[PDB]
Design a protein around this ligand. Structure first.
Ligand SMILES: Nc1nc2c(ncn2[C@@H]2O[C@H](COP(=O)(O)OP(=O)(O)CP(=O)(O)O)[C@@H](O)[C@H]2O)c(=O)[nH]1
Ligand SMILES: Nc1nc2c(ncn2[C@@H]2O[C@H](COP(=O)(O)OP(=O)(O)CP(=O)(O)O)[C@@H](O)[C@H]2O)c(=O)[nH]1
Ligand SMILES: [Mg+2]
Ligand SMILES: [Mg+2]
Lengths: 336, 303
């Protein structure tokens, strides 16, 4: 339903005219941020040990309710390369990175644009960004750390961008540069969410502390915290199916003493976060929505006249139906 | 070499600072070397600077311990009392909550079992104020740390957990700031028992000094996990495990066998290091000997 609410809007031609926010993942080097984005997107963004996201990537996901068949494309500088298989995604994204950032461990401002259109993926915009380092290593220069922070601010400063702060459960949250960085650009936290990761790697004894953090009890966020567990590095090497990974996460929380609670509180798991985010997204649409009624109405009335002529025709079936949904929706949402 | 320091000790100074992030195990290192009960724990547990002055006795076979700050110079009559007392000091001085203070604590311990040494615990680096501290806490702390590591005497001991990508380590930057060529800098890795399975080769590299380079190079150890602190585990028992832990542990066996893992290694390592600076820093005290001699020439001038 409301998950297809957006497609209806896309049908009313207001998706261009109002598109709601993107979602950025900001946090330290190797804090699992690509792993979150991959977890939500179900697309193979490079995840790993060390320096693995080496320049910004926008992922534009679009649902298919009509043709139902896979699509994927990359774009940067000179190239708009076509990808003919989901298999190829990670391979290609690293091609892009090598090409663009220079094949070592240096990074670049230059954006990558992945656009994927599929049945299984949700309507969404996500943004991977490199991790915060505070020290240049191998072949990067002194001010790398700063370079990166500049690059990150340049995304989270936009009003559209929902900052998703990604922290591992095994670091004292007060260490978390990205929280400071977030409230800098979002003083009252209306586009900010805290994600904990690597819960499976906490020191035995310290799990109460972690819980508090997530019960939003040590550093306060307005929109509050989530916690998940992604593929550990072993599980990446073993190429584990996403669906299998999502399985474990459930098991993991389901049978984990301290953290059981956080699940039962709607505060753990990814499908939680997915849902959570959707509402976040859902809120912004609603806020924007009264200001598009003329487009929405005109459009609807323009479509109804188109299809009214095709009246008692079979070929209208698909769209005579499609319209229908749009209509019912609108009446109720407006009544709101 | 151990004796050269006793010849130096006989004539009555290098110190060693532990700098690193909040909950990175730094107090745990200093406790590991000192065998004294410095408050180590979850969250914010070193909440203002402490100088530990250790002095060997083969003479007395008597334990001694004293704390000092602001006014107080409190006597401690049992090693049992140390942690209790250090928290009393902290509460007294920093204000009970989570806020910190520049004000130094001075523990002086004299015992058989402890080495001749000077160590400095310092609070962890936070980058965000929580509960009852103010915005610029993070900076307050960094100022406080620089104020110790900037001295030439101070051997900066950077403490990193094995489960953070080393490039995240603020304290490394902070160290080269005040020690460009790395003649008083050592990297310690901790919590090796908390690495993600798969990433252990990476850790090793770090320690083989292969991802961020230090002149004096790296060590790695494992200290009481929080459970083991709640279970009050004997130090000697903890030192036992560390040996087991590395001894039977696949990737990290090597690092042991390379003299690059364990505490008794680090102890030995540091000792050599420490000796360097005495030899290095001695000319300034020959200068003070002048002062002493000229003050003494008054005694002879009086007769
Ligand atoms: N055990 C465990 N490991 C995890 C979890 N999430 C991620 N990891 C592991 O941590 C590492 C970091 O994940 P990744 O998504 O690559 O972090 P990243 O922030 O994207 C790397 P960069 O900062 O350069 O973008 C990977 O080795 C991954 O397998 C988790 O929940 N549990
Ligand atoms: N699992 C494991 N845990 C460790 C290790 N070293 C320390 N810890 C744990 O992490 C916590 C940190 O110890 P502590 O000495 O407080 O670190 P710290 O950096 O001095 C804390 P602060 O910054 O507040 O002064 C303790 O709970 C301890 O049990 C280790 O080698 N392995
Ligand atoms: Mg990444
Ligand atoms: Mg401490």
């Amino acid at each position: 339903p409301c998950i297809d609410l957006i497609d209806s809007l896309r049908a009313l031609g207001v998706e261009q005219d109002l598109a709601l926010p993107a979602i950025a993942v900001i946090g330290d080097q190797s804090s699992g941020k690509s792993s979150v984005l991959e977890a939500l997107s179900g697309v193979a963004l490079p995840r790993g040990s060390g320096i693995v996201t080496r320049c910004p990537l926008v992922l534009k996901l679009k649902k298919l309710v009509n043709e139902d068949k896979w699509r994927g494309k990359v774009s940067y500088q000179d190239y708009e390369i076509e990808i003919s298989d989901a298999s190829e995604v990670e391979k290609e994204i690293n091609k892009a990175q090598n090409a663009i950032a220079g094949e070592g461990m240096g990074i670049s401002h230059e954006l990558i644009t992945l656009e994927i259109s599929s049945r299984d993926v949700p309507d969404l915009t996500l943004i991977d960004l490199p991790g915060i380092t505070r020290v240049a290593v191998g072949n990067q220069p002194a001010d790398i750390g700063y370079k990166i922070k500049t690059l990150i601010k340049k995304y989270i400063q936009r009003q559209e961008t929902i900052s998703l702060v990604v922290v591992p459960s095994n670091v004292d949250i007060a260490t978390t540069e990205a929280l400071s960085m977030a409230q800098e650009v979002d003083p009252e936290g209306d586009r900010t969410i805290g994600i904990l990761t690597k819960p499976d790697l906490v020191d035995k004894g310290t799990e109460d502390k972690v819980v508090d953090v997530v019960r939003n009890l040590v550093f306060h966020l307005k929109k509050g915290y989530m916690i998940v567990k992604c593929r550990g590095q072993q599980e990446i090497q073993d190429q584990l199916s996403l669906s299998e990974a999502l399985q474990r996460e459930k098991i993991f929380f389901e049978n984990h003493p301290y953290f059981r609670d956080l699940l039962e509180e709607g505060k753990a798991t990814v499908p939680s976060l997915a849902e959570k985010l959707t509402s976040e997204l859902i809120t912004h649409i609603s806020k924007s929505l009264p200001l598009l009624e003329n487009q929405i109405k005109e459009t609807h009335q323009r479509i109804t006249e188109e299809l009214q002529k095709y009246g008692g025709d079979p070929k209208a079936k698909f769209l005579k139906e499609r319209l229908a949904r749009l209509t019912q929706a609108r009446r109720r949402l407006a009544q709101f």
